[PDB]
């Protein structure tokens, strides 16, 4: 993965013009410093290994965190799976138009103690369950529901105090690549929704406490980490300048191209 | 000389006498779909003399206070001959293009244009909670134009056409990462771009998905002195290359 | 019962590790691959494409297309300066935002050469000559054309070929430089001057423009990936 080394150069007086080109051809000039001045011969041992597509994207990044309470009605979490709610991972994946990768998925579950009124609260270790529902299956409506059986849905159980849980997901798509951008509609009538929301059908992730509420309430929080493996990328794209506003679309409020200085000659 | 070209496609011909090179895609030429990459089982239609020919869109005027124009690419030719009549009767279709932008002036005019072809160019809305409608995103074979100011948020379904953000929330100077070419009135006269089929699926419906967008943006504005010709037009011709269709049903 | 012994670093989550993990959907059949044009393998091919740099940041030009145009006219004296900016490709606000300077904000170190292309978007009847200099640090900024001719320079004559390339070379004590603003690893200055005047005929406008592009050579390299300081967030996007 080594970079190219420079060669020696002599004084020239010729009809060859390496520096003069035409930028109107849509073509970048391939000149080196050993064409426009006198150079010495060095050999470079530098590598281009840390700027690969694999080394750039294969790193864990937090995509969501949700809370749920042990002794409350309406106390279980859900999340419709996407990658467009955090600012840092959304900007890295959107330097390319199409992507294709396997996934690695890690959860970090903590807990806290809520102000009860009983004397001598003493709880055992807590067990949590995270169930993944593919699009079209039945959803849970409460904590003590039949849908947490997981006959065919994959789910993971975890006891507090151990190493964090971790799975691996293949390239689960209908098309030949994941699409970061989509210029079109859902209906053929060209009404309704517009954009990447027409392509996002990846499921829902549910979270609950398996234990029952003994004497004090407990508020847990699970953080979700994504990590792309075996990455392929096509059609690079300029990085995003304006700040992100929504999850479903591209909309923005306009901003200047750079920050400003006082004069064109000031350094 | 390297300044003359001649492109023949069907019964149409383009000649030019001063030009740069022709930019072809990401290094690939348009070609028909293979057998190990296809998914639809029925036999495709390849008419290829009636649709693969040069179609000329309308002309726009380059003024001094001008900001830019854009066209959505498999929608401008949706009423053009037998290319727009095959799109209505068929469900799927794939197509590469060749685009020839032409703008001529004298040696006493000055200016510069950026001619770029961007795939999957989602435009943004002025009101931050909605999405723009179809009539604002594209017109058939007529240009939609940018503005040098900012559209207000009181307009519900309109496109945010601040030209320095290029409508998509990026820097307009970084648009040279796509296949592009410049028209410099000092040296150039036309720009020719050949684009292959770029999508994540082998075929796609040509009515609810525009996979290419042609933007023409003046970085250096038009300027001339008194007595010179003030009316300067810009004309775009687009020819499909290796078009084929699947799924014949009623006319829609 | 094979006897083992667990070391420090057990049951930890280091976010840049490389292990194997059991699959959640076993015997899944993925969609077969397709030949899509434009496959990128290294991020050092995006940075080698040149992009227009906004030299004209004068506080009412940033929200317009006037930030990219450098004004060039016909003078009455000789030796005036066109522009000038320091060569900090990841810290200086001129090169902060270009296609090379946005990849550099993900990394900490950089090393290699840098190209600078200049296109003359004037009339076909206008002439001119320019001096495109680069000065290594240690002294100040060159204040005259006589100071700037003592560095690495090229003399550009406009004509049929309307572009010229200034290739600022790698002159450094260390093998790498810092992307952030560091006084120990400063890189120098890039200036432009009038060699001769801009001589136009009658009925030609005497005020022209110049575009500038910036890219990298084939020996460019980056190191020590980090997070960018440009994107930011307070609440979740919904």
């Amino acid at each position, epitope marked *: 993965a080594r970079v190219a080394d420079t060669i020696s150069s002599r004084p020239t007086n010729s009809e060859s013009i390496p520096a003069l080109t035409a930028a109107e051809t849509g073509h970048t000039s391939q000149v080196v410093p050993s064409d426009t001045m006198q150079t010495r011969h060095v050999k470079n041992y530098h590598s281009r290994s840390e700027s690969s597509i694999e080394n750039f994207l294969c790193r864990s990044a937090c995509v969501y965190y949700a809370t749920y309470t042990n002794n409350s009605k309406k106390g279980f979490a859900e999340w419709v799976i996407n990658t467009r709610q955090v600012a840092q991972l959304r900007r890295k994946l959107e330097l390319f138009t199409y992507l294709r990768f396997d996934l690695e998925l890690t959860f970090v579950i903590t807990s806290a103690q809520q102000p009860s009124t009983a004397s001598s609260v003493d709880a055992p270790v807590q067990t949590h369950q995270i169930m993944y529902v593919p699009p079209g299956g039945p959803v849970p409506t409460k904590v003590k529901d039949y849908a947490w059986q997981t006959s065919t849905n994959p789910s993971v159980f975890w006891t507090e105090g151990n190493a964090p849980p971790r799975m691996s997901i293949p390239f689960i798509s209908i098309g030949n690549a994941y699409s970061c951008f989509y210029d079109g509609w859902t209906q053929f009538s060209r009404n309704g929704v517009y954009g990447i929301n027409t392509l996002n059908n990846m499921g829902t992730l549910y979270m609950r406490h398996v234990n029952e509420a003994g004497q004090g309430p407990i508020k847990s929080t699970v953080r979700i980490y994504f990590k792309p493996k075996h990455v392929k990328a096509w059609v690079p794209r300029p990085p995003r300048l304006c700040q992100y506003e929504k999850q479903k679309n591209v909309n923005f409020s306009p901003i200047g191209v750079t920050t400003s200085r006082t004069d064109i000659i000031t350094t | 000389s390297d300044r003359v070209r001649s492109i023949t496609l069907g019964n149409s011909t383009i000649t030019t006498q001063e030009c740069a090179n022709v930019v072809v895609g990401y290094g690939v030429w348009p070609e028909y779909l293979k057998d190990n990459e296809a998914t639809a089982e029925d036999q495709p239609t390849q008419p290829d003399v009636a649709t693969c020919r040069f179609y000329t869109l309308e002309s726009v005027q380059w003024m001094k206070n001008s900001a830019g124009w854009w066209w959505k690419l498999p929608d401008a030719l949706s009423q053009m001959g037998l290319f727009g009549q095959n799109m209505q009767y068929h469900y799927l279709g794939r197509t590469g293009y060749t685009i020839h932008v032409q703008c001529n002036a004298s040696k006493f005019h000055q200016g510069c244009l950026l001619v770029v072809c961007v795939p999957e160019a989602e435009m943004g809305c002025s009101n931050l909670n909605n999405t723009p409608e179809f009539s604002e995103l594209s017109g058939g074979d007529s240009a939609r134009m940018f503005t040098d100011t*900012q559209v207000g948020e009181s307009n519900a379904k309109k496109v945010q056409t601040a030209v320095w953000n290029a409508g998509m929330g990026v820097g307009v100077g970084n648009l040279t990462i796509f296949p592009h070419q410049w028209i410099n009135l000092r040296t150039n006269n036309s720009a020719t771009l050949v684009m292959p089929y770029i999508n994540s699926v082998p075929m796609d419906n040509m009515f609810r998905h525009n996979n290419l967008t042609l933007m023409i943006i003046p970085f250096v504005p038009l300027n001339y002195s008194e007595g010179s010709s003030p009316y300067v037009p810009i004309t775009v011709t687009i020819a499909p290359m290796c078009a084929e269709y699947n799924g014949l049903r009623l006319a829609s | 019962g094979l006897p083992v012994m667990t070391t420090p670093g057990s049951t930890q989550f280091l976010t840049s590790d490389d292990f194997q993990s059991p699959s959640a959907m076993p015997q899944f059949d993925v969609t077969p691959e397709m030949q899509i044009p434009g496959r990128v393998n290294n991020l050092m091919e995006i940075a080698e494409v040149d992009s227009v740099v906004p030299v004209n940041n004068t506080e009412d030009n940033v929200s317009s297309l006037k930030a990219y145009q450098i004004p060039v006219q016909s003078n009455s004296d000789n030796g005036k300066q066109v522009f000038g900016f320091p060569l900090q490709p990841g810290a200086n606000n001129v090169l902060n935002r270009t296609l090379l300077g946005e990849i550099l904000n993900y990394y900490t170190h950089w090393s290699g050469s840098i190209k600078l292309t200049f296109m003359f978007c004037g009339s076909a009847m206008a002439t001119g000559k320019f001096l495109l200099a680069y000065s290594p640090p240690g002294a100040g900024v060159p204040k005259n054309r006589k100071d700037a001719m003592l560095g690495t320079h090229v003399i550009w004559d406009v004509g049929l070929q309307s572009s010229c390339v200034l290739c600022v070379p790698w002159i450094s004590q260390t093998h790498y430089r810092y992307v952030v603003e560091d006084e120990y690893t400063a890189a120098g200055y890039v200036t432009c001057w009038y060699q001769t005047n801009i001589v136009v005929p009658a009925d030609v406008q005497s005020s022209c423009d110049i575009l500038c592009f910036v890219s990298a050579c084939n020996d460019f390299s980056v190191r020590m990936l980090k997070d960018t300081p440009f994107i930011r967030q307070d609440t979740f996007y919904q």
Partner: antibody
Amino acid sequence: VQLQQSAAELARPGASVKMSCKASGYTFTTYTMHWVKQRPGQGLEWIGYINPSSRYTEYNQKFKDKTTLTADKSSSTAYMQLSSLTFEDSAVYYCARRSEADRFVYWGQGTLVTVSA
Amino acid sequence: DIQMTQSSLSASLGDRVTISCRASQDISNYLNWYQQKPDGSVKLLIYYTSTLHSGVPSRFSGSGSGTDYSLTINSLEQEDIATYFCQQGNTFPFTFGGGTKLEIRR
């Protein structure tokens, strides 16, 4: 990060005032800054905002002809000028920084405007 | 314009308080709740129907869909005695609801 407003002001009916909101702790030209008015017996009310990078302002249709918003990038301040002052314009005026979509995370402390003779 | 209809509530400490506010049309879960202290400082509490801002204690919760929405404080303290507004972020312009003040019961 915090926003710091100016002192309380007093004016005659027919005069003009000019309030400020000195923002520190962040890049001023990135986020727009909105102005909210609270009359002491009723609820909050939106006036308008100004994009500091492009100097573009947008007003509510009730305060379209009376208020004027300006800004400067050097000292990182946002000004608001009230004109043709009547007895309805004696309230508390807040400057707020709009978050991701429609949220106001950071507010000013408010200036008390009152008209009298 | 969307009318945001919400005047004074009374509750003892350690009790559950419920503040509600009704819009005119469907706003589709784009509601925010603010809190104005009696010295005159405003802060964001819940930046969706239910999602809490960072730095807000767990006493506060939100619920609702469509037109009817609500705010719940399950255990009242002395720090939570303030005025609460609801604001919609759906259409132009931004409209705030009226206040709702809390007070001690007896």
